[PDB]
């Protein structure tokens, strides 16, 4: 039960008549499903490796100039020649300078003038590519059992890790006493890995797009050149000084460290030492609860007492959590673990962690229950010995009907178009919505691509006045949409 | 140069913290405040344009804007 | 799971001693390896761990100065390096690990830590 | 964040409940629920008889028991075996990231 | 960064040439029109917007200019 | 002629000696002795516990 | 039962180790060793010089 003490968990409600479930599936998020008789599941995305990386291209960000030659020509002779300006390891300029009797041309006029200096790379950011086949996704079921943690078995936690890559990207997870979970999933739509780059620089790397990658304004090498000899754009790091007119002299341009630094604000920043490892991935999955089954159903409930060994306490999702113990005959045995009113009149709770058991008499359990809005009972146990805790949630309905709109707004902004897979059960209407979302956001990337959220919240500003103030009113009403949305995403944008 | 082409829009963005996002959020904002803070003789004939170019108040307003963001940008 | 230190040694004052843990039975880039002293008669005492998945590490203030703690991922050994001894450095040195967390940051302990410890290796001086 | 609290010493006639006390600060014990006790048998490395406060490994009995309250951990052995004659060490990840054992506390049984 | 906040306005300027005048003359001009390029939706976009916020030819080409240069900068 | 210094600019820097504190939720805020010295750079955020 | 305290608040105070520090006009910012020290406390004023 990992998904708990993180404030990305998300609960995913539901099973299709197949059994089975989209669930989009990101890194620092999780996701907790639930399912009529199947056991409650944690699934968290860990680890996303992209493997075997083959460098296309190398920057220069702090170069040097050493051999520095000049060659002078007098007026009215052309341009003069060195043999170092057809060197490719050579940077070279023609200018003009002042030539007369005291420079010793014997013609008054400009006379060209060439100067090369040597440049050589001291340090460089390697810009490498994945093929998408060399994608292998890491994932962690635990199933939502309420088992303590054991120290003698070679898995500590029940907690068990699929890899899902592209080749392979079906497998089922064997949750010991719990049946098998299968998933289902689409690595090669998680991330387009031919249209990024892993831009190493040094000591640090990020997740980066290839045109701009390709479009940086860098000396660079192809990627293949072992001597690095042959730099190109050599020119956008050394500048060539004539002032007066008199003298020509080249310099480097320093270290471009931090300037490229601020130009990656806005990748992701993903590790790139001892593997390729990019910890800001979504993976969407199918997953398949047909052969997954609840573990004691066909246990007697308990009929001893219980005692609290960890006090209950609230996560950050509007559920609870306690840890009690057991102290009664029944070896193992169902937990009775109800959420009723003051009298006892009603059921106001739900259980999350499904079917509580108590395995071993000296093994606490703790039990995550989801109680309502307002005032509750959590009553544990039956009545010789029964203990009754009070709790009150804080919230309202309404609030957190809100916060799940917002909730699923943010998931619309973050996983745009995939978000209706997030949940999904097939249908019509979730079809319809995915493709409607497509065709949207679609025109969304092509006529804002490579905007600032700044200037996204601009345009937005411009389209919802337009909108206001339209004659037309399907005209006025659709442009204030698409105003109020590009106002929305231009202030969740950039995170 | 590279830090002027600095990858904000390029979409590829996750629910994970990017590079500089905090810092980076505002400093242009931040930037443009300064500039006009240390040059508002220039805002001063840049308001007057805006005003006398286009004709609805929408109008000005949306020139002032630009222009003001355009300046110190324009580097 | 066993960890296994090296040998008892005996160090004249001011020298440098340096022992070493072997973790078998699990996967070593995945735990973090800490070291703990225990003078003669003394409580236990914590010294640092190195988190083996990527070598960062963390010494107690009391010996940021003179411990340095080293992985060989490949030999699955950590290694405890205690230079300009003195005196007072007679103790049996201990060996106990904690797991690091899913991306080998590890930077919040596991509640079990210290969990599996190792025999000790005997310093004296 | 300096060593914790207990006493030198700690005895109990075979079969009585005894409890040992582990007194630390705001950030010690009485921060977080990083209390663990580890039973140290003289000639041998400590053993994790508890954690998490009051949880135990998979191979502890389960007469040990460990409570907390403000900034002092308990424990309390109740078959108290001539086997639970041991140095008993507290311990706590302190909030800045690192641990503080305690003293130390030895149980004489008989 | 240092890089966004470059030293040309800055009026101290005498007849020796600066210190990338001859490179950064056209370099702003250059990464808008690569910008341009790469990004043609935006482009589109903006012309529309320019087109129905300016009554006149002159409103509608100022404010679509305005657009294009802030775009990349704003960035 | 004899100019003087006017302000030191930093251009290229290093961090080193970090560390962090943490506090329970609705605690308030973790104490860093290294807070009161000036020299370290240090900052306050929230993590999930 | 078992407060926890969540912030401190100081209601009579009292300084010591004045000091000072003076930069002639069109020079810049004085500078003080303490002014690195955050018990001290400190503030930068222009004086006629
Ligand atoms: C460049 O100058 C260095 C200075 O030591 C010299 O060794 C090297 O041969 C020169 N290379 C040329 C002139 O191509
Ligand atoms: C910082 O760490 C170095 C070791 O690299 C140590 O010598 C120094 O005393 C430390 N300083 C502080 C203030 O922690
Ligand atoms: C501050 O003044 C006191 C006397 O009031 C003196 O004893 C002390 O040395 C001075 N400096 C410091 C750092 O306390």
Known sequence: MRCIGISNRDFVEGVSGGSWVDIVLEHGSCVTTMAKNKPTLDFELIKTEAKHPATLRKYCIEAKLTNTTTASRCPTQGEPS?????????????????????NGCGLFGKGGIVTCAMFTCKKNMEGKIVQPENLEYTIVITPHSGEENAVGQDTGKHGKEIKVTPQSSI????????????????????????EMVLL??????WLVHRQWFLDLPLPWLPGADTQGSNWIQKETLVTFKNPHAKKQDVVVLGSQEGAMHTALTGATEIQMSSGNLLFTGHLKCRLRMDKLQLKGMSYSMCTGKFKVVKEIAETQHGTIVIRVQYEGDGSPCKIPFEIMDLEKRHVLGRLITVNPIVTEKDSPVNIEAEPPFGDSYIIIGVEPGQLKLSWFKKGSSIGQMFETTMRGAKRMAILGDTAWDFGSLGGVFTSIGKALHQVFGAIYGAAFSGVSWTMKILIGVVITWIGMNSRSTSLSVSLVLVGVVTLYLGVMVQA | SVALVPHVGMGLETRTETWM???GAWKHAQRIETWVLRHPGFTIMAAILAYTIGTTYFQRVLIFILLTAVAPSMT | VQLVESGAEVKKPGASVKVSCKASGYTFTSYAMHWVRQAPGQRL??????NAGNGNTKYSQKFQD??????????????????????????????????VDDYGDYWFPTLWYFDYWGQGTLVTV | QSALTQPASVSGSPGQSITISCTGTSSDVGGFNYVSWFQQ???????????DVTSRP??????????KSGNTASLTISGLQAEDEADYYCSSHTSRGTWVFGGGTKLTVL
């Open chain 1, 82 to 102: 060195l043999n170092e300006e057809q060197d490719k390891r050579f940077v070279c300029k023609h200018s003009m300078v002042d030539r007369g009797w005291g």
């Open chain 1, 171 to 194: 497998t089922e997870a064997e949750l010991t006493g719990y049946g098998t979970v299968t998933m289902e999933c689409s690595p090669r739509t998680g991330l387009d890995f031919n």
């Open chain 1, 200 to 205: 190493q620089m040094e000591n640090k790397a």
């Open chain 2, 21 to 23: 996002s905090s810092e």
């Open chain 3, 45 to 50: 005492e914590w010294m640092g761990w190195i």
């Open chain 3, 66 to 99: 003179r411990v340095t703690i080293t992985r060989d991922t490949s030999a699955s050994t950590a290694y405890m390096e205690l230079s300009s001894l003195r005196s007072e450095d007679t103790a049996i040195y201990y060996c106990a690990r904690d797991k």
């Open chain 4, 41 to 51: 048998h003289p000639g041998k490395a400590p053993k994790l008889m508890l954690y």
């Open chain 4, 58 to 67: 998979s191979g502890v009995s389960s007469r040990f028991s460990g409570s």
